[PDB]
């Protein structure tokens, strides 16, 4: 049963070309209704006269208007219906831009995402077909390594689903996605590719993203540094004490100085242990 109502109709082969009460000229293939073309006004099918190379329509007038039937579209789609997807692809060089994407979508609806991917002019339709197929690599080329982050975020999730972490780390990189990218990445235990995607985070006040990156194998890679950058100077002093290479003396000073400028006088800090905070000789391991 076909969606678009048949106001009048005609049989061209076993395919039914009909007019619709939407002014749509559609054709029935497969029990599926496709729109061959749009009628602008209300039109009736007089008949198909092979001579003129036309379908002859008439309005309210007992005169002629002509629409040539779009046979290349019809044959592509008919072949798709039959489940002769390859056959429909032979038709494709003579299906233009957006029409290849549409005919592709027909191919797809009937099934076979991949054959639809080759014919679809539009890269986006290829890109989605590639996610659907589960062809990560093909979807990856289609995104294209530099930008198209939206493509990559869809790919990155798809890659995590398949538990193919590898493709996922690359998608997230291209995506950028510092917050998400870090989560996959900081699971390293050696911080192998986690610093880059959090370099910014250090100084953006995305300190949290930054600390996980650098402290992951007993190393202070830029742990301290993230804390200085942000102005969370106390926290760098504190870190320095923790792992004691006694760097604390310098950090506490820089910090103490910062208290005097940032209006503290009764906790002013400019001493070694007298005015609140405590430089390294107060401190210990």
């Amino acid at each position: 049963e076909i969606q678009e109502i048949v106001k009048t109709g005609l049989w061209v082969g076993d395919c039914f070309i009909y007019t619709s009460s939407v002014n749509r000229l559609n054709y029935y293939v497969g029990g599926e209704i496709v729109t061959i073309a749009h009628l602008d006004r209300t039109m009736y099918l007089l008949g198909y006269i092979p001579k003129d190379n036309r379908l002859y329509l008439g309005d309210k007038e007992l005169n002629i208007v002509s629409y040539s039937l779009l046979v290349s579209v019809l044959e592509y789609q008919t072949a798709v219906m039959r489940r002769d997807f390859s056959m429909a692809d032979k038709v494709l060089p003579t299906i233009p831009k957006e029409q290849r994407t549409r005919v592709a979508h027909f191919l797809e609806k009937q099934g076979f995402k991949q054959q639809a991917l080759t014919v679809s002019t539009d890269p986006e339709h290829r890109f989605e077909l590639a996610l659907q197929l589960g062809e990560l690599k093909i979807a990856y080329q289609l995104a294209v390594e530099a930008e198209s982050e939206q493509k990559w975020k869809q790919l990155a999730e798809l890659a995590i689903s398949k538990c193919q972490f590898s493709l996922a780390q690359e998608c997230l990189h291209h995506a950028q996605d510092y917050g998400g990218l870090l989560l996959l990445a900081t699971a390293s235990g050696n911080a192998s590719m986690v610093n880059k995607l959090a370099e910014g985070a250090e100084r953006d006040g995305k300190n949290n993203v930054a600390f996980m990156s650098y402290f992951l194998q007993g190393k202070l890679d830029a742990c301290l540094e993230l804390l200085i950058r942000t102005g969370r100077l106390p926290e760098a002093a504190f870190l320095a004490r923790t792992y004691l290479p006694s760097q604390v003396s310098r950090v506490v000073k820089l910090w103490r100085e910062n208290l005097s400028k940032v209006n503290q006088k009764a906790a002013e800090s400019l001493a070694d242990p007298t005015e609140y905070e405590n430089l390294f000789p107060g401190l210990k391991e």
Binding site: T186, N190, M193, F211, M212, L216, Q217, W255, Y276, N278
Partner: protein
């Protein structure tokens, strides 16, 4: 007065009390004024000033009630606590703060904390990678088995290379940062 003198004398308003505290740099009074101002913002800002006087116990309390468990989680190895660092992890687990709950597992020598939190997130992949690298392949495997398997894959980061960190060599922590106060 930026070195309170006049300030000490009139302090009756919960705001004047708040103000007084940052101008000294001793935020012990701040928290109470901040309390009596009935407001979260004050607790996080005085907590930050607190970290500045040096002591993180006071920061924790504030930051906990402003609900910045994740800031705390970040602070905590920096501070060198491990007991307090665990408390933050749970109460940030539930928020699904992935730059809160997530932190602490790294910060202790073993990663197990993440593995469960991530399991609850449904982030099975992330949970396996974290666990596996520490040599907690068994937990990593649990996550794979409950969810989609395939743990074999080697990402741009390691999926099984040692994670071990010696957590905080300091015996007295920086929640216990020394102070005299003037």
């Amino acid at each position: 007065k930026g070195y309170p003198e006049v300030a000490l004398h009139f302090v009756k308003d919960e705001k004047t009390r708040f103000s007084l505290a940052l101008e000294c740099g001793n935020i012990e009074i701040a928290l109470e004024a901040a309390k009596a101002l009935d407001d979260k913002n004050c607790w996080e800002k005085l907590g930050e000033v607190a970290l500045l006087q040096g002591n993180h116990q006071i920061v924790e309390m504030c930051y906990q009630r402003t609900k910045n468990f994740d800031k705390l989680s970040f602070l905590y190895l920096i501070t060198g606590n491990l007991e307090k660092l665990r408390k933050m992890m749970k109460i940030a687990e539930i928020r699904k703060d992935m730059s809160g709950h997530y932190q602490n597992a790294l910060y202790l020598g073993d990663v197990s904390e993440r593995v469960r939190i991530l399991k609850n997130c449904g982030q099975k992949s992330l949970a396996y990678l974290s666990a596996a690298t520490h040599g907690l392949d068994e937990e990593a495997e649990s996550l794979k088995e409950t969810f989609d398997p395939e743990k074999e894959t080697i990402p741009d980061i390691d999926p099984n290379a040692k994670l071990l960190q010696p957590p905080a060599p300091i015996m007295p922590l920086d929640t216990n940062w020394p102070l005299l106060t003037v």
